[PDB]
Design a protein around this nucleic acid. Sequence first.
DNA 1: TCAAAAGTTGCGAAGCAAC
Length: 1095
Amino acid sequence: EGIDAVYPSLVGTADSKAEGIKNYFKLSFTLPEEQKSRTVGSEAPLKDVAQALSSRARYELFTEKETANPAFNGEVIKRYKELMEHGEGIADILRSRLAKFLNTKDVGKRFAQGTEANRWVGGKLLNIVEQDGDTFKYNEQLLQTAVLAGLQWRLTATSNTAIKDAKDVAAITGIDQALLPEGLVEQFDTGMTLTEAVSSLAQKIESYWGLSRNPNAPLGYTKGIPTAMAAEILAAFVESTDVVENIVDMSEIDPDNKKTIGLYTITELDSFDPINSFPTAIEEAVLVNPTEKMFFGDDIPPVANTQLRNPAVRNTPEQKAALKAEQATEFYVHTPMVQFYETLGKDRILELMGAGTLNKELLNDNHAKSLEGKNRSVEDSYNQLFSVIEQVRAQSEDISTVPIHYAYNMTRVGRMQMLGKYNPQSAKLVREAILPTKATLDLSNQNNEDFSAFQLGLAQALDIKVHTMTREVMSDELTKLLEGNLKPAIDMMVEFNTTGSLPENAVDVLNTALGDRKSFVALMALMEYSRYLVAEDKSAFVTPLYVEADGVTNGPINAMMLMTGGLFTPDWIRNIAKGGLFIGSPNKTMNEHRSTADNNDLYQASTNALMESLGKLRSNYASNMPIQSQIDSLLSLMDLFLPDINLGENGALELKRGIAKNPLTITIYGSGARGIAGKLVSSVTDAIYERMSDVLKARAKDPNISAAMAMFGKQAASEAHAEELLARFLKDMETLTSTVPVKRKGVLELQSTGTGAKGKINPKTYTIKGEQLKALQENMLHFFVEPLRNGITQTVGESLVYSTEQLQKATQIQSVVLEDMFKQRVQEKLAEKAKDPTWKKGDFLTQKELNDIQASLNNLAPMIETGSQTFYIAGSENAEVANQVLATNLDDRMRVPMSIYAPAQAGVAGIPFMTIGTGDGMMMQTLSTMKGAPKNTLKIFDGMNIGLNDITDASRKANEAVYTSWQGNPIKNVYESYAKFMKNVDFSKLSPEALEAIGKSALEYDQRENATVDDIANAASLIERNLRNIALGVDIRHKVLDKVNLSIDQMAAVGAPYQNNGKIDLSNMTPEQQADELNKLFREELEARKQKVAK
DNA sequence: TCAAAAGTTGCGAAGCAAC
């Protein structure tokens, strides 16, 4: 009588083994102990809620609160009266759609005679209907509560959607990642797919119903009934033009595939709509514990219990203390920046910091697609920021004294991420209007220690490398700028402060003054400096300007220290000092290192190594004229359209550090050679398309110009020079796209593809795609990426790349077994339910049964524990296991497959998990919970913003967190889990397909052709012993380094290093002598451990 | 390379065939 008394008129009995029609709504949901929604028990939820939104007094009575939100004023109330009236029209559409369903093919007649039409995939919505004479009808309470959830979804769905990159789009369309056409990635980010639109809508409907799931009920009904309602509601929104549905077929570009995907977009509201100032009135009136809201003053967000997108993993007690600390920080609004934005306007913001207005006639088709993509990001963040200001402004008269709190969560890689899409952590436009930092400096004298802190904030914002020069040098360079190029822009800003108006040529003045330093933080620097000039009391200046303590190549430096074994080498000592680890130099900062000792970083060192490898490759084929010409053509082509590569008149090749930035970062994350080659070619093609646009522009100005001058005029001294460069571009393009190199027996041969690029170029429709793109990627892969990888390996060392190889092999093998066992166990269960008279194929399993299968995998160690973090590499949500439809709508459309939480193959994802989680992920967690942790800071990944009053103390603490995180042992954590897996595994019970996959990671090509199960088992145990040796070597290295004096300056902005107070002096020694001293301590530690085992 | 997942529709009432 718990749920059978609330809904007594629903069709069918509530017995799982009855004879007639059974009601699976009452067999799957139970009333909660304490109420969660205020719509349970009402008769007309659409009228009860609409009554509560008609006044301020009624809203407080319904919600049982002393005072409502101050933003709930008269204008918002009127806008909410039209929304409810619009919601009554959506309900009428749903009621009429059902009656049509029951009238076709006599579905209603058959269902009344005993046919179980409520168990079909397309008829699961018959479990919430009631009899009415000779026909059926909806249940008013359940239907109207679903419409209320639909109206709230229509207002906030867009701002909560996720971000899909090129990798995600490839998985949807099925095309290869490296050959994704132009504009396809950004097209899929405008709208939402069917799976993500229905799933997000279904979650809202279930929450508003306020019931609990039954653990012993099938997953096809506890998840299908809410989903069948979501598809019907979305169909009604399309009919009402509130949602636009678009169908895109992939056969127009790739004839091979036949996929046809549909995209949905929500019609947006006006930027001046009063409803944007308080868009969550419905949610807070229905849910006892709302989720979508904004927190002011003493409202502190709650702490989450499970990892983001990972319900099986719980946040450790140490990780929960970090979330609590970061959610207590108060954010404030900077009024002068907000007034500058609205006076400038949205159109002028796009012109300045975006692409401005676009003339599609005078642009290339591929160029114009990219330009439109960059305009959307700036416009979306502008609209989001100013909708927040409207809500903040109603709280009090002074907008700058209203505290703001934000909610965080733990990502699956161990990072702390803000919730939302456009927040201070993610959007750079919003970063300069909402700050947690503040200061009160004394700037009456220019020689004060407070003025030097003020200059450091301005210099860094204006793109000056403040961590490579001393304080006196930085001050000199800033003064040259403030009285040179930047003077006209500062003068305009001074007049704006006193008057409040801007000139008509504001964009021209800022573009001319800033130039290549243009950014959002560069505008704040001009605003703060011009505010200081006009101030009358300079001894108490209050500013929110900040200084960021960025990490110098945080990625590669972390990996080189956490995953290197064996003895010390003089090259490791030299290269590790470029990241900020100094041995034998007390109180040494990075400003002193770069100024006197070495002015190169890891990016510059790798480029120097690449040049050495390139010369070796060139001389290797000194007698191969066809090969030599192919290498020359590739380098000539990249010279024209890339600023980092230049060709001398004598053939000398000079490279800059720009080309080694992206490849070095992604090589650490385990990216293959094919990924780097695809990215490098993409940069070259983008520059080519931009050049074709200039041809169109020059032709319009003068239609009698020559082709060579219209394209290379800006880079040619005379007409003859332009003609020469045009010939090079034509010849190089046809050479690379005709013949490609193929590697076999270890040497390279030239093979003709027969698809050379010939014809006349059209500037409007010029495009490189298909077999022409693949030829370009083959030349770059075998002539530029292979030498590049050799150079990177030399700088980071061969010992580091050996640790990453074993790490990837162990995780891939373990994940393969976990996935195969999971599938093998759900098939045995489904074969037992086949003998159940009351079970129908399609209900799948229950939640209790799914937990039992997962709980049987605990002896294979699916999770890696470091003592303060937990990682689950193999977890995913795939629809392959279920392999059936969950629910459709009444029109036999919008079919949604069933997805469950099941393990999947890892691949190369093992390397990023350990490098990021135990690296900057662990360091930031330490920083928040350590003793005397800094306050009022914004902690971006591998960075931190600090107020001007405590730059010195907070920087020292930041270096101490880095030192603490450098004592971790990621290889030891993997070894402990892999040792337990090899103790309880049984290789003889694996499927033949799984055995082949294991052999691809544990055996060589010539040995895995006809391997047995004993060969695979034996080869897998050798990896276990390889991981044991690496972990022992890393452990000894950290103990030896703790005995000597060190200085840590990884965050190099300010110049405050941390000391490890060792008691062994390694000063006045060369790097060769220091390596000998450390190797002596390595052997003393090793011998002591071995004697302990013997004794 | 890490931070989620991925086609649509007739016929008949599940799952293959057509595009």
